[PDB]
């Protein structure tokens, strides 16, 4: 009814554990939503061009064209670690844990209450709020995946991470069919590169509404709306990472001479020319059996062309990477191709006290060694002389094409058989937990944004809407906008995430590294005295395992 | 008890054929293993460095810098073909035989036989054997698969391959992460290339332990050790070699004029232009339909980047291939990248009577014909106008970088969905029989070094070492080494082996491929007049199979 | 083929999917890793560089 | 927008110590390898040190090595070359020098200060 | 010790063409040694003209143009303006982290 509640406010973690070293974690969400009522009631096939930007030459990069309808509707987004998950619950769940299951999900929306404001015709500006009992909100749950999947963590767009932190819904919109061109250029070219936007192609439209595809309930202030249980099908999440390259695969050589004393500078020698050593390679002309010559079983990681841009129906697109770079642990600044930058604003772990429209920004460094170090990679010719001249080697600093700027690593692709790769870690907070699978016939072995995907299907998409609340003066036949009553909502959304972990176990001697919080990052987990709080990411595959 | 037996030698082979043209191979395998006490009772972290080699320009192939954890235990492996099957056997195999199963493996240690040594002070050497009734050999097998995988195939470090020869474990040790940089050059290359060992990563280090990892048993001159039988759950390995390339896939064309008199100067003519025949191709700007255009169904094998080097954290490796290169069966001479060459001692299969440490060294050439003649590759343009042109042709020949040295092909890759590939051929007598899987979460589809591969785990290593014979004198707290009473052990190592396999079937009138002693490699497979025995190496996938 | 055609000459036709999966290599480019833009010349390498 | 400013140049006796200071602004400090250049008067551009890496990795010229250190702290922007046991050859100018590829270096210096002088006499 | 040679002096004529050449004593130029060049006027900081043998930094006239010629790096000034008078340097990336600069080349607009 009008005056009691629907629901209870739940945003509480529960570590369950179980038999032989598995534990549940429910994690359990509650959020206060804030939605306004549509801009528009209607749906619009909007198209965002920015020519300008990319009429300059050397640009192209920043192309931002594209068609989108953008609905009436709000999405209701929770794929985020932040929504669900405290530094501490995080701390705990990537220190004692080895390996990540996601079990089920919940969510429901209780709580109702809608509001209209009258403004008065003072010239100071005043309003009053006043209950609207009889006003609706409109729930739309596409619990067939009917419509397009828009996960809001790519744009930051999810729940906020703070649960006494009101929230609100993203506005939904999706991708309309579009046809473009774009040649690329650089600063230099001369001309007017070949820029145009073909319109639309008629066998590829796909208009989808809310109303036509979903069933929509009509919640009022003494309503609720459960989705009830979603049972996931994903392969398990791992905790750890790998480390071995394939320099560290398999047996040693034996060492004929050890150090006699302890130092740097004292070292274990092979003691067996390189040429008179026993083993197996796959060099078949040469005689050589060294470290980076004998065989391996596999290739872990791969070399693909980084900051490779493809062109397609509807303009270009950067090729994505499995893996990020290598010697960005040795060095930051190495980070690029394959590490993934999360910029955000205050709803999802930027300082809540900051002005200004600059987002926080973070690139991740995954602990896993599976990346390259193109600077250090060759070709050379099959005969193998060595010392190998300037003609039979191929170096990262040889030009390519005629580019001082380009070398042949940058166009290398070593994909294979042979290669063998892990799947992206979680990132936290920031980071999507699960993403739907593609509907093409051969699918990727692995996404780039999320570590678990949906092989059948993941749950529907939240959808919510302000119920149109007219004014006496509506006239359908009118061409102007519908007169509306200013009213707005607000609900609670509770949501539960189910997922099931393994308990890690030391294998070795040394201890492993865990998350700890110290003197430099102390404050970055208390409120300031203001209130001002902040969610720093932080690193999940913490502990090592053995790849081979 | 000290005067009781606790085995039985058996070197035996089995070939228990069952119906429906199935045979049970089961393979017995007895050695007498010498083994010293280690020279060190303790864990060593040892980095071997060569720094002085690779600061030669164009010598970065030639890269050892690695580090490795030395422990006091040695490693009992009979991965390898040679250690079970004698050259009659793997004949009978390979002729008689269409498909190879890997069933089970056992293995056991019995007659544990513990002697001291004890050296006189007179002044020419003199020195007598003890028996030492209540020494101990410490044995453990690690069939949790927690030590690190390190088979000694790959090292020419298995058992010795003559059942009447006495053979010794290896010493094992394992890779710790290291940290290091080498920046490729060539002979020319002025300046000093970066080429530092930057350390350890403290979040890789994994140091394992014997004693802390698994259960060791005490064997005393009257105890024996069972492992127990282990069942693999590998994929079958075929005995047949396909020789299907892409222009041999699919319905030959019409011949409408046929030869009239035999003779190779005779030939058939299809009868019909180019441009004027019939049939489907995925060149949809062209007329022409030959049979390097004609459409086939998908592509057999694949062309890679051969002599190619990547580098990681730990250094620059080289890229592996599936396949073996394509010409190398026309001219031997062809052989290299993807024809694994195999070097390996007295042990192993080079002559017992020889001297020195050059080991004896082959290049395996498979019968299957999945590989590539890079000289014989071309791309040209888009628009397919023949006779081609300078400008719109790349060729083998064309430098790549301004290397004349390098060309297109050394860096061309052509892996892709279509991609249809074998796997690798069995080595006798040095090739690996099964290699773990890797943990990564992608793992390859094949590996390179054995053609079984582990997809849950294989049986456990196992550890062997002379528990230590302290002396009188013996004090923990000293900073000195441990003084021990000098002893050895010599222990009978039992092994089964279990294979299932299909026996081949004719389906041809003409007769196929057999491996068959003749003159020229009659003396190959007997022992000379002073007893020098060798194994030479024996080719598997002999008998031919249609691809499609 | 139109059954009373005369020759030896076949109908021909290329078969254009629906199916959005290819790619336009007039449009692909590579660049430097830095990103630096807008792209200069040497940093760049165009469907238009031999 | 890149700009460079050195200080600290000043006429020192034989044997002393001197510290230059290099502010950077209108670019990430941190995400670039900095460095010293030396130019004697009337002489040609001489390669003094260099930061490089996340790390803070220092290389030194023969010239300087053992004498000259080379540091940066990225809070407040600057880089600083401390030079202990000045000789009378190390009088010169002495320019800030920034390398404008942070991911792929450019191994050269792509922005300079006006440069500080030193004077080293008795 | 790594030593850079480049000519003393040089001179070109106001719109012709001249080309500053850098090479080692012991050794050849490459793009291995990212060859940079650098500007420097009277009582003036040096000023990047080229780096990485081709590229030059944003603003530098596209009358500068660098390369590899033979065994050295190359500066070729075309249509040289009266402003391109200055000295021009030479610096040679020596591997490792190790930079060498040349002599330099004092080149006067007739």
């Known amino acids: 009814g009008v005056g009691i509640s629907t629901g209870t406010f739940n945003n509480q973690t529960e570590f369950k554990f179980l038999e032989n070293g598995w534990v549940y974690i429910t994690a359990n969400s509650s959020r206060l939503v804030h939605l306004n009522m549509p801009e528009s009631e209607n749906y619009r096939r909007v198209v965002v061009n920015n020519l300008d930007k990319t009429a300059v030459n050397g640009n192209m990069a920043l192309d931002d064209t594209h068609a989108e309808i953008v609905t009436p509707w709000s999405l209701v987004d929770a794929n985020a670690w932040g929504v669900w998950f405290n530094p501490g619950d995080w701390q705990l769940i990537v220190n004692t844990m080895s390996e990540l299951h996601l079990v089920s999900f919940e969510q429901e929306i209780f709580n109702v209450v809608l509001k209209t404001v009258s403004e008065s015709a003072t010239q100071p500006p005043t309003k009053v709020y006043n209950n609207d009992l009889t006003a609706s909100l409109m729930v739309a749950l596409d619990s067939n995946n009917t419509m397009p999947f828009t996960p809001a963590a790519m744009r930051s767009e999810t729940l906020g991470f703070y649960p006494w932190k009101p929230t609100i819904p993203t506005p939904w919109r999706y991708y309309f069919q579009w046809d473009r061109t774009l040649i690329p250029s650089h600063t230099g070219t001369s001309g007017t590169p070949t820029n145009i936007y073909h319109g639309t192609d008629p066998d590829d439209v796909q208009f989808y509404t809310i109303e036509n595809s979903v069933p929509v309930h009509l919640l009022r202030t003494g309503d609720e709306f459960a989705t009830g249980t979603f049972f996931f099908d994903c392969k398990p999440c791992r905790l750890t990472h790998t480390w071995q390259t394939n320099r560290a695969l398999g047996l040693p050589p034996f060492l004929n001479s050890l150090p006699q004393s302890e130092g740097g500078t004292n070292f274990g020698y092979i003691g067996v020319q390189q040429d008179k050593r026993r083993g197996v390679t796959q060099m078949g002309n040469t005689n050589y059996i060294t470290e980076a010559t004998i065989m391996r079983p596999a290739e872990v990681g791969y070399s693909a062309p980084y900051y490779s841009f493809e062109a397609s129906t509807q303009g270009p697109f950067k090729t994505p990477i499995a893996a990020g770079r290598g010697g960005a642990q040795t060095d930051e600044n190495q980070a690029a191709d394959g590490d993934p930058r999360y910029a955000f604003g205050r709803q999802h772990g930027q300082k809540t006290t900051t002005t200004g429209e600059t987002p926080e920004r973070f690139t991740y460094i995954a602990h896993q060694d599976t990346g390259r170090y193109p600077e250090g990679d060759w070709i050379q010719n099959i005969n193998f002389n060595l010392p190998v001249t300037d003609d039979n080697v191929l170096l990262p600093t040889d030009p390519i094409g005629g580019k001082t700027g380009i070398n042949y690593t940058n166009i290398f692709n070593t994909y294979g058989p042979l290669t063998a790769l892990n799947n992206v870690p979680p990132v936290y907070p920031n980071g999507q937990i699960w993403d739907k699978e593609f509907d093409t016939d051969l699918k990727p072995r692995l996404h780039v944004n999320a570590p678990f995907v949906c092989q059948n299907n993941c749950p529907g998409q939240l959808f919510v809407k302000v119920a149109p609340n007219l004014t006496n003066q509506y006239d359908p036949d009118a061409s102007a906008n519908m007169s509306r009553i200013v009213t707005y909502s607000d609900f609670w959304w509770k949501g539960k995430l189910v997922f099931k972990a393994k308990l890690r176990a030391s294998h070795t001697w040394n201890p492993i590294q865990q998350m700890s919080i110290n003197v430099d990052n102390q404050f970055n987990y208390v409120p300031s005295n203001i209130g001002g709080m902040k969610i720093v990411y932080e690193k999940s595959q913490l502990a090592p395992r053995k790849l081979y | 008890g000290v005067g009781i037996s606790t085995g039985t030698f058996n070197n035996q082979t089995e070939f228990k054929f069952l119906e429906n043209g199935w045979v049970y191979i089961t393979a017995n395998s007895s050695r007498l293993v010498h083994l010293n006490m280690p020279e060190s009772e303790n864990y060593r972290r040892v980095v071997v460095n060569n720094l002085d080699k690779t600061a030669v320009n164009g010598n970065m192939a030639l890269d050892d810098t690695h580090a490795e954890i030395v422990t006091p235990w040695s490693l009992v492996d009979a991965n390898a073909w040679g250690v079970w099957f004698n050259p009659g056997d793997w004949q009978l195999i390979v002729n008689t035989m269409s498909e190879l199963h890997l069933v089970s493996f056992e293995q056991e240690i019995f007659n544990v036989v513990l002697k001291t040594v004890s050296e006189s002070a007179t002044q020419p050497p003199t020195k007598v054997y003890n028996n030492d009734l209540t020494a101990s050999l410490m044995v453990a097998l690690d069939s949790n698969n927690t030590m690190p995988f390190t088979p000694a195939a790959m090292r020419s470090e298995t058992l010795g391959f003559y059942p009447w020869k006495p053979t010794i474990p290896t010493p094992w040790r394992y890779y710790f992460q290291w940290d290091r940089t080498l920046i490729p050059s060539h002979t020319g290359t002025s300046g000093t290339p970066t080429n530092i060992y930057h350390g350890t990563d403290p979040d890789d280090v994994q140091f394992y332990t014997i004693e802390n990892s698994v259960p060791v048993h005490l064997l005393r001159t009257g105890d024996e050790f069972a492992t127990g039988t282990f069942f693999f759950d590998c994929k079958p390995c075929r005995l047949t070699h396909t020789w299907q390339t892409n222009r041999a896939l699919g319905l030959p064309p019409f011949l409408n004029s046929l030869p009239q008199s035999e003779g190779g100067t005779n030939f058939g003519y299809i009868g019909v232009q180019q441009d004027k025949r019939r049939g489907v191709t995925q060149m949809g700007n062209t007329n022409y339909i030959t049979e390097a255009t004609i459409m086939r169904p998908a592509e057999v094998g694949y062309s890679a980047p051969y002599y190619s080097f990547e580098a990681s954290t730990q250094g620059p490796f080289k890229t592996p291939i599936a396949a073996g290169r394509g010409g190398a069966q026309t001219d031997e001479n062809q052989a290299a990248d993807g024809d694994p060459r195999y070097a390996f001692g007295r042990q192993h299969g080079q002559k017992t009577t020889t001297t020195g440490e050059t080991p004896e060294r082959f290049t395996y050439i498979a019968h299957q014909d999945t590989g590539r003649y890079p000289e014989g590759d071309w791309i040209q343009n888009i628009n397919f106008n023949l006779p081609v042109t300078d400008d719109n042709v790349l060729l083998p020949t064309d430098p790549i970088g301004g290397k004349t040295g390098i060309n297109y092909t050394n860096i061309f890759n052509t892996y892709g969905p279509l991609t249809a590939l074998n796997n690798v051929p069995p080595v006798y007598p040095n090739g690996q029989i099964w290699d773990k899987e890797f943990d990564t979460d992608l793992k390859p589809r094949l590996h390179v070094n054995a053609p079984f591969v582990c997809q849950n785990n294989c049986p456990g290593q196992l550890f062997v070492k002379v528990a230590p014979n302290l002396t009188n004198q013996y004090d923990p707290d000293a900073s000195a080494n441990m003084s021990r009473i000098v002893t050895y052990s010599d222990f009978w190592w039992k092994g089964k082996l279990v294979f299932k396999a299909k026996l081949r079937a004719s389906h041809t009138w003409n007769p196929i491929q057999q491996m068959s002693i003749n003159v020229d490699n009659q003396f190959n497979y007997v022992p000379s007049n002073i007893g020098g025995m060798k194994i030479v190496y024996e080719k598997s996938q002999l008998a031919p199979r249609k691809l499609y | 083929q139109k059954t009373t055609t005369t020759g030896e000459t076949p109908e021909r036709f290329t078969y254009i999917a629906h199916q959005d999966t290819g790619r336009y290599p007039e449009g692909d480019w590579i660049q430097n890793i830095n990103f630096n833009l807008p792209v200069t010349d040497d940093n760049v390498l165009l469907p238009t560089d031999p | 927008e890149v700009q460079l400013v050195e200080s600290g140049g000043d006429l020192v006796k034989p044997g002393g110590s001197l510290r230059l200071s290099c502010v950077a602004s209108?670019?990430?400090?941190?995400?670039?390898?900095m460095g010293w250049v030396r130019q004697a008067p009337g002489k040609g551009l001489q390669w003094v040190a260099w930061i490089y890496g996340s790390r803070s990795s220092t290389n030194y010229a023969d010239a300087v090595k053992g004498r000259f250190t080379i540091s940066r702290d990225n809070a407040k922007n600057t880089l600083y070359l401390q030079m202990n046991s000045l000789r009378a050859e190390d009088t010169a100018v002495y320019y800030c020098?920034?390398?404008?590829?942070?991911?792929?270096?450019?191994?050269?210096?792509?922005?300079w200060g006006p440069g500080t002088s030193l004077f080293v006499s008795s | 010790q790594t030593v850079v040679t480049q000519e003393p002096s040089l001179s070109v004529s106001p719109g012709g063409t001249v080309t500053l050449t850098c090479g080692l004593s012991?050794?050849?130029?490459?793009?291995?040694?990212?060859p940079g060049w650098y500007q420097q006027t009277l009582g003036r900081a040096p000023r990047t003209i080229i780096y990485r043998t081709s590229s030059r930094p944003s603003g530098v006239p596209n009358r500068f143009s660098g390369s590899i010629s033979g065994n050295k790096a190359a500066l070729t000034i075309t249509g040289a303006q009266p402003e391109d008078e200055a000295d021009y340097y030479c610096?040679?990336?020596?591997?490792?982290?190790?930079?060498?600069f040349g002599s330099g080349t004092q080149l006067t607009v007739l």
């Open positions: 610096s040679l990336y020596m591997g490792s982290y190790t930079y060498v």
């Open positions: 012991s050794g050849s130029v490459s793009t291995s040694n990212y």
């Open positions: 209108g670019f990430t400090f941190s995400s670039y390898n």
């Open positions: 020098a920034r390398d404008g590829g942070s991911p792929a270096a450019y191994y050269g210096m792509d922005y």
